[PDB]
């Protein structure tokens, strides 16, 4: 398990695995971990699935009975807020939830954090899962505000490729996501090994 | 139930051509001491199916009076129409399930055994709510011990005869009479066919010990 | 597993099944679990396999060193007295669940033996995780002094049932007979289940498969 | 764990909390703020089980607010203080409990300054300086060798300057950045961010 | 399980059921529960198997050896004493409930009892065994001081018969000894 | 488990007149990886290998105490080691600990030293011997090689097909298994040379 | 004390074709080391074009199965059309959840068609995620079948083979082959075998024996 | 705790410790030395319960010199890392285990260079770059992004500056001073003390 | 402690010890461990004793609310059936070992067993308490079918007397109970 | 030993003018069955003092072997110097505290009685070793119950004659017969002066049981 999350310039760049294990057996190799809240959200999957799964799309549905309310879209820390509002009530129960959020606001950026702990911070880099750690070395590496768009697609593939390559509880299809102003777009699915074969020179 | 007081042991049933014969024993057993030596762990439900049970004694006696109190009531209702025996199966399962899941179990092993309508019929009821059909069951240690016979002679003989069966069972008891130490040697034969239910009397086994003149 | 014993008019016959099992998958289809102990006794083994293999490879050292010591045959108590004695001084730590079989010059004696080290001197046993089954036919169809071919057949009907039944064997029940003056020892004895023949040739290529770095090293 | 001075003054209060968001192996986030401004000259700090920080800070808040709005006028720190004892005690008893450490700083125009000191166990405190966390140890010391009760806000400034300086030197975590706030006549002015290169 | 032991005026009678079990599953159904250690003398167990079964032996051991040293036939309370301290050494990982009696020359017939601690009493009736409790209810009430030999035999037929019918271990069959100076006389019965 | 520490699979599969050996790179704790050349295949004299699977410190206290034994024999004796006698020696080695138990679950493949019949066996971490003749297995991952193995398997096999077949076993039952995997190294052995060779695996 | 689940073990395999969704379980019952029958089919056929698997424990399985049917019922009784086979999936996830804090011990496979008439598999967890997925094997037999449907379905792990589509009576072969040589090795796995097939005509069913033991 | 990277080059090996003794609250030892020169061309580090280590230094460090002056010569790395761990492997089976995480630096005459890596477990590797602790997690990540076998030395010291300098950026310890060392064809050349003013 | 139930022709015939203990200390050296509820029923109460003696007082008020709502004598089977009822819904907290007897105008004596599990059955006789085992030993050797009134007081003198005898929590005294159709006949036997 | 099987129960003990008097009964009770109710728990040592004891009485077996092997081994020295009661009192207690050192405690509670060169000797052994003197002992609920009637008629008078102080003792073992479950109504007396050591027979209680009349 490791996603990332990372804010800049243009827009938010957002990647994960795809390999979602069971123990020391593997289940799958395409569990697509970020989950398509709206046309102007994404969220992640950060331990567990069904928790994630279940609440995101609780979130989704909340969201869109807020604008057909108001006619007016919802912010991004509102969206967490209710996240927040809602785990916090099956607190010690045993939920386990590290996700993230992700998109455009009114203000502009936003790259929120909420966890099952109910940690709901800001920030503009995070990574979460197993083998995050890997991510923020590789990421704070090579992280600035100033980048381009092909140097943080390359800064996001080659991230997780070293975070799978060193975790054992990661890998399969490398999802790319990128928040823009209007909307969040697919980049690519990439496969570990066309990337090994890629970078390894 | 979280502690079984006093419990019964295996029961045998089996289906023959129109009919089912059902054998259980009459102890009543504590601990290692048979406390109660004469008690009945067959209810003769209706006239076409009938239950024997495992378990706990006093949950048999409850799930009696709740059956009965059903039974009585259709009946009361004066349509013609009856329980089939699956009928009861699904109930039954459906109980045993929502005791379960309120983490207060009915401690039991319950056959349901009934001949309705040219159909025999044999279901089975766990205390976890498993449930399912069989030619040939056999609860406890039975499904240990008795099982086998069963499953031997259906298989080299898909369908049997009343004097057959009734004749199978009764080695099986036997058998069980010589090897389950929870066992006693006075057991009650009930059947079912289309001209009723007959529950026959406390039979008893012919033992040998030939073996024991052997050092 | 489940193993059987069995006395008839002159001797044992004995039988076992072969699947040795490592928690919940079948690791072997053909394990030997009929073991040598001496030309007349032979023994089975239960539970854990190595204790077993270990343990009655010892007792047949000893009874050979024993037999040739003395000059003549063996006697079955002597290895059921060593057994016992083992098996207590390790105080039921090894579990080995032993069926203890041979002919004299008494003649034969057939011995179970639980792993604390209380033994039993039986007309017929069963032991092993389905014994049950073949406890059940030996108690439905034994008479005493029964002849040849009609302890096989029960020995074998026992097994077969405790095979029919849960945790038996895959193989081909193995059985071995002991007289006063002729031993057999019979593996493929009866092979009730045949493998379904294969549906496709799902064989690979001369090449299907990417190689990083080869390898030769000539020899003589 | 980390980190929250609460120096009194004469007629002002010296709060300083760090910026540190960290999980158990990683520092997330190195500009994090604690620091909840409930009123024109009313503080509040937090530190506990940090998915009560937000919940109660939430309750406090806006409740607070909710009683600006009804009467007209700024509560007085020590009702406030009271307030918040009070909810402890009430959410300590019950199925849901809280563990968070407060203090909260405030300013009087009758009664001037105040500082109080909570727990995680509900006790009202009226301290001269407080903390929390580990750093508390070394810095109350570190802190009670040096005061006097007639401090200018410049020595209590190079007072906390050498409190962080001796903090950065012995103790087991990072504690990059430290946030300082002020009280006094006026209200919350926000001093520089307070950080140190350490070799 | 059940055994019992009766003496008389010219010796001693013994009794058993058979039927070993594990937990609820019977491993055997029909036992010599009781064990001969020298020409005149028995013992019968309860508790544990494995652990009397060796014990038997090394009593048979040391109590063979030391009456041939003697070159007279040994004492009762001498293999009472034997188990009595082989008991009583290793209470900590032994379960026995051996019973000693048999007849002697100089004593006549005699019953001793060790429990599972490791005491030794002469007694001159004694129950032993899981299902023993029963026919201890009314063993001192169908007794009567002086009894004969075939008093003794329907006695314990009695006795056995009723605790091999109530409890669920005990059961099987009836095995009988009678020691006295003239011989022992086993015999298997059922009623 | 204790035997899923540091993860490792070792199948060794029987063919028409040679046998085939094949084991896996990752050497790590328990999530974390370290190296992609930790040695699991050892060899013990000519055409004859054996492959170490479990708790890495058994791994290579127990190939060193098993070589230690082996030149001693040969030593001794000027013959080189039959299998059945290697079997019982490392039976012999394991059951000494008895109740202080290595971890670990040795497969010996090898030929005749007089012909050329092949042979497979494995161990358990007490003391089993099993011999058999299509493949054995071990390691944490079991249930996958059981099924790829008793799926591709064949009596009579030319030593490509083998080379194939356990490739694809090696490579399909790695890719499922989790703790298990960084690359595969295999050992091709038969009467007249030894065949060594690394197949690109996926590095996920 | 009671425990209150229990494992009774099981095998379900699906297939997702171009225009079929092939579903296939055995029959078999265990408990322990005991056999409590050889006929108890872990297929359910719910739709025209849906079937679904039960395996885990087994009260549960009748359980969620009779409340599956109910709610099939009410929403064909309150909005006038069948169900597709997504809506099926969502609603089992939501049950799932829906007894998050005491669990279903339950592995599910849907199989069945979509609305443009192809084949869909829905996986499940015991929990209540799900994916749609071209194959999966659930049950005690998982591992013994995932690598050999990569190895045949997914074409992985080859050099220079070729995707061909997965015909029919391909498919039927594959599925007899594992099912064979799967029961080799189980101990959960045999006495039976029941195939459902799901065209664009209807629910077919094909009864293939398996070893005894 | 810490962590204590090795880089291996070419023809060297980069190590470099840390010089932290703290015990769990306050930092007793601010420039702590972990370096055990072996012989003249091997090192050895260590890293765990802190009452081993010294042990270890003592006995490894003391036979390996007794070696020495016994037959006329300089061990190799690949036997001395054999020995290390031979020793671990039978330390751990008794009433008394250690728990150390080790690793060796060594340079041969014949062989070059040599980098071991040891564990808690008694395990040998062959490593191109050891790692242990959380620091493990941190260095292997960005290590692993820029590695090339064939690096000159000054290569070397500007990914480890780079890789410090990104210590500490998320880190939750303190680490202000690693002392440095280096291996070549003529011995251990202590390299300057690398720390940095953080802010 | 031990408590007795046993019915003949034309009635039933009780008997309990007393000796209320408190782990091995006699809190209570007298008591009557047998309870009135009707005119014409008793029990008879083993296990803990605060359980039993609510019960036995909520069952005496609904069963007197009933009877007198029937203007009609009570059957005992009713009682029994109260006495099951609130055994079995409410188990798992309490410690019963209630027994019932009693005269009857329809029925005759009979006597009903409510052990601790609260199964109900009717029987001819019956043990009851911590120390019953033992004459449960013999009940069942001693038991002549056709008893008089003298032969079942007699019978359940020497049965308590041998379980006061034996066990060590029963002892005291012994309390005897005579219910027919005349009349209710209680004494108190002492040594 | 861990677990205690077969328990005695209290010792009762007590000076008087020129001798001590000790009275125990007759009950080996395991758990709450009265399995040996014939058994001595008083051994009769030489000629001057005298040991009675409770807990398990195979240990108290044990005790009488050593101790009447140490008595004949001095008697067999034929010097005509024996033991002191105060010298066995202290091997005793040196004995089972080297016992307890070990981890192994033997199960007892012990009271050694002696009367030798006209003065009388009582003391205490208990399985921790701790041990003193005293004018009246009193083991296991004796120390509850017949403590006070002692220590009451001590208070009041602290000399005693032969006859009070049997027939104290008397009553204090009638009123251990009336609320001890683990009593029995059968004990012996034993009894040492300079006349020797006497041990009289199994007496018994006279009981009342007039209250049993009231409800």
Redesign the interface.
């Given at each position: 398990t490791t996603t990332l999350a990372f804010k800049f310039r243009h827009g938010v760049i957002v990647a994960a695995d795809s390999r979602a294990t069971a123990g020391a057996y593997i289940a799958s190799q395409t569990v697509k971990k970020v989950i398509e809240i709206n046309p102007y959200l994404l969220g992640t999957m950060a331990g567990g699935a069904a928790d994630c799964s279940f609440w995101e799309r609780l979130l989704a549905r909340q969201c869109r009975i807020y604008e057909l309310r108001n006619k007016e879209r919802i912010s991004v820390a509102a969206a967490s807020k209710l996240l927040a509002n809602m785990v916090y009530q099956y607190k010690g129960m045993g939920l386990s939830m590290g996700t993230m959020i992700c998109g455009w606001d009114k203000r502009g950026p936003g790259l929120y954090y909420v966890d099952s702990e109910g940690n709901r911070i800001s920030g503009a880099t995070f990574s979460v899962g197993s083998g995050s750690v890997y991510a923020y070395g590789v990421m704070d590496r090579g992280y600035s505000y100033d980048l381009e768009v092909e140097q943080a697609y390359d800064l996001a593939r080659r991230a997780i490729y070293q975070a799978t390559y060193r975790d054992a509880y990661s890998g399969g299809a490398v999802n790319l996501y990128h928040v823009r102003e209007d909307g969040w777009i697919r980049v690519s699915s990439d496969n570990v090994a066309d990337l090994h074969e890629k970078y390894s020179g | 139930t979280q502690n079984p007081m006093v419990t019964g042991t295996s029961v045998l049933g089996v289906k023959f051509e129109g009919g089912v014969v059902i054998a259980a024993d009459m102890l009543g057993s504590y601990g290692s001491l048979a406390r109660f030596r004469n008690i009945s762990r067959i209810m003769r439900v209706n006239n076409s199916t009938m239950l024997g049970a495992s378990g706990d004694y006093a949950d048999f006696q409850y799930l009696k009076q709740v059956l009965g109190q059903m039974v009585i009531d259709e009946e009361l209702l004066g349509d013609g129409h009856s329980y089939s025996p699956r009928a009861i199966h699904s109930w039954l399962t459906r109980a045993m399930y929502s005791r379960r899941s309120k983490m207060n179990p009915l401690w039991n092993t319950m056959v349901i055994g009934g001949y309705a309508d040219g159909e025999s019929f044999l279901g089975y009821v766990d205390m976890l709510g498993v449930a399912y059909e069989a030619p040939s069951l056999a609860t406890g240690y039975g499904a240990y011990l008795a099982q086998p016979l069963l499953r031997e002679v259906l298989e080299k003989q898909p369908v049997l005869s009343q004097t057959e069966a009734r004749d199978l069972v009764e080695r099986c008891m036997r058998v069980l009479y010589y090897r389950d130490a929870r066992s006693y040697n006075r057991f009650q034969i009930a059947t079912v066919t289309e001209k009723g239910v007959e529950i026959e009397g406390p039979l008893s086994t012919e033992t040998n010990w030939d073996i024991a003149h052997m050092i | 597993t489940t193993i059987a014993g069995v006395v008839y008019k002159d001797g044992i016959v004995l039988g076992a099944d072969t699947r040795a099992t490592e928690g919940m998958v079948v690791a072997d289809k053909n394990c030997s679990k009929i073991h040598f102990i001496s030309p007349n006794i032979y023994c089975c083994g239960a539970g854990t396999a190595a204790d077993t293999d270990m343990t009655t490879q010892l007792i047949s050292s000893n009874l050979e060193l024993h037999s040739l010591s003395t000059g003549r045959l063996p006697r079955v108590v002597t290895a059921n007295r060593m057994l016992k004695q083992m098996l207590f001084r390790y105080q039921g730590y090894i579990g080995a669940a032993l069926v203890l079989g041979g002919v004299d010059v008494t003649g034969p004696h057939l011995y179970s033996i639980y792993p604390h080290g209380s033994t039993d001197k039986l007309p017929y046993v069963t032991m092993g995780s389905g014994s049950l089954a073949a406890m059940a036919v030996f108690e439905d169809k034994f008479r005493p002094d029964m002849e040849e071919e009609e302890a096989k057949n029960l020995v074998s009907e026992a097994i077969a049932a405790g095979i029919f039944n849960d945790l038996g064997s895959g193989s081909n029940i193995d059985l071995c007979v002991i007289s006063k003056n002729k031993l057999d020892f019979l593996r493929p004895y009866t092979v009730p289940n045949k493998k379904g023949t294969r549906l496709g040739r799902y064989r690979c290529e001369k090449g299907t498969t990417a190689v990083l770095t080869e390898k030769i090293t000539p020899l003589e | 764990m980390e980190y929250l001075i609460g120096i009194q003054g004469p007629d002002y209060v010296l709060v300083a909390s760090d910026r540190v968001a960290a999980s158990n192996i990683v520092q997330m986030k190195d500009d994090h703020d604690k620091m909840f401004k409930m009123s024109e000259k009313i503080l509040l700090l937090c530190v506990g089980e940090a998915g009560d920080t937000v919940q109660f800070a939430e309750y406090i808040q806006k409740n607070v607010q909710l009683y600006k709005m009804r009467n007209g006028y700024e509560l007085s720190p020590t009702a406030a203080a009271n307030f918040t004892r009070r909810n402890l005690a009430d959410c300590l008893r019950s199925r849901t409990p809280y563990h968070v450490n407060l203090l909260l700083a405030g300013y009087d125009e009758h009664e001037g300054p105040a500082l109080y000191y909570m727990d995680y166990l509900a006790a009202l405190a009226k301290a001269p300086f407080a903390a929390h966390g580990y750093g508390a140890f070394l810095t109350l010391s570190i802190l009670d060798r040096y005061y006097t009760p007639t401090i200018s806000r410049e020595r209590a400034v190079e007072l906390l300057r050498k409190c962080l300086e001796e903090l950065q030197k012995r103790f087991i975590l990072n504690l990059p950045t430290f946030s300082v706030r002020i009280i006094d006549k006026n209200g919350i002015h926000d001093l520089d961010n307070i950080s140190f290169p350490k070799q | 399980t059940t055994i019992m032991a009766v003496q008389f005026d010219g010796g001693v009678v013994l009794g058993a059921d058979s039927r070993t079990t594990t937990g609820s599953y019977i491993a055997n159904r029909v036992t010599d529960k009781l064990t001969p250690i020298h020409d005149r003398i028995f013992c019968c167990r309860s508790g544990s198997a494995a652990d009397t079964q060796a014990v038997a032996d090394a009593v048979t051991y040391q109590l063979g050896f030391h009456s041939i040293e003697l070159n007279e036939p040994p004492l009762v309370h001498t293999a009472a004493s034997l188990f009595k301290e082989m008991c009583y050494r290793y209470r900590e990982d032994l379960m026995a409930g051996i019973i000693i009696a048999g007849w002697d020359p100089q004593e006549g017939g005699q019953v001793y009892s060790v429990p599972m601690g490791g005491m030794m009493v002469r007694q001159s009736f004694a129950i032993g065994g899981s299902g023993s409790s029963y026919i201890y209810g009314y063993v001192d009430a169908t007794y009567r001081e002086g009894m004969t030999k075939e008093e003794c035999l329907q006695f314990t037929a009695n006795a056995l018969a009723l605790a091999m019918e109530r409890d669920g271990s005990s059961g099987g069959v009836i095995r009988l000894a009678a020691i006295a100076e003239s011989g022992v006389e086993r015999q298997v019965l059922l009623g | 488990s204790i035997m899923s520490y540091n993860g490792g699979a070792v199948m060794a599969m029987k063919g028409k007149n040679c046998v085939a050996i094949a084991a896996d790179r990752r050497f790590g704790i328990q999530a974390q990886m370290v190296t992609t050349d930790f040695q699991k295949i050892f060899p013990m004299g000519d055409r004859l290998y054996i492959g170490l699977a479990g708790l890495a410190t058994d791994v290579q206290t127990v190939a060193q105490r098993l070589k230690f034994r082996l030149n001693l024999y040969e030593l001794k004796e000027g013959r080189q080691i039959k299998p059945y006698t290697l079997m019982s020696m490392v039976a012999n080695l394991l059951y000494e600990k008895r109740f202080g138990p290595y971890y670990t679950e040795p497969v010996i493949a090898g030929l005749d030293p007089k012909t050329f019949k092949p042979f497979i066996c494995s161990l358990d971490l007490i003391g089993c011997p099993m011999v058999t003749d299509d493949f054995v297995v071990s390691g944490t991952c079991a249930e996958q090689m059981y099924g790829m193995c008793e799926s591709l398997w064949e009596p009579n096999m030319d030593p490509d097909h083998l080379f194939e077949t356990i490739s694809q076993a090696m490579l399909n039952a790695v890719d499922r298994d989790a703790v298990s995997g960084m690359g595969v190294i295999v050992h091709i052995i038969e009467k007249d040379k030894i065949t060594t060779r690394t197949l690109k695996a996926r590095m996920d | 004390?009671?425990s209150?689940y229990?494992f009774?073990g099981g095998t379900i395999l699906a297939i997702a074709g171009e225009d079929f969704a092939i579903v296939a379980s055995d029959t078999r019952?265990?408990?322990?080391?005991?056999?409590?029958?050889r006929?108890?089919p872990k297929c359910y056929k719910l739709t025209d074009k849906t079937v679904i698997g039960c395996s885990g424990?087994?009260?549960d399985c009748?359980?969620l199965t009779k409340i599956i049917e109910a709610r099939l019922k009410m929403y064909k009784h309150s909005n006038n059309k069948a169900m597709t086979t997504g809506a099926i999936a969502a609603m089992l996830?939501t049950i799932?959840?829906s007894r998050?804090?005491?669990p279903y011990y339950v592995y599910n496979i849907i199989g069945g068609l979509d609305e443009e008439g192809k084949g869909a598999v829905y996986?499940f967890?015991p929990?209540?995620?799900y994916?749609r997925?071209s194959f999966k094997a659930g049950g005690?037999?998982?591992?013994?079948?995932?690598?050999?449907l990569?190895?045949?379905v997914g074409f992985?792990?080859?050099?220079?083979?070729e995707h061909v589509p997965l015909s029919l009576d391909?498919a039927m072969?594959?599925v007899?082959?594992?099912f064979?040589?799967?029961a080799?090795?189980?101990?959960?796995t045999g006495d039976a075998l029941r195939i459902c097939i799901v065209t664009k005509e209807g629910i077919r069913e094909e009864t293939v024996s398996?070893?005894?033991?």
């Open positions: - | - | - | - | - | - | 004390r009671f209150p229990v009774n019952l265990s408990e322990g080391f005991s056999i409590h029958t006929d108890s424990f087994h009260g009748l359980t996830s799932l959840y998050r804090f005491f996986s967890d929990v209540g995620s994916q997925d005690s037999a998982s591992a013994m079948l995932q690598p050999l990569d190895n045949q992985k792990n080859m050099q220079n083979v391909r072969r594959l007899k082959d594992v064979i040589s799967a080799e090795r189980d101990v959960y398996l070893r005894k033991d």
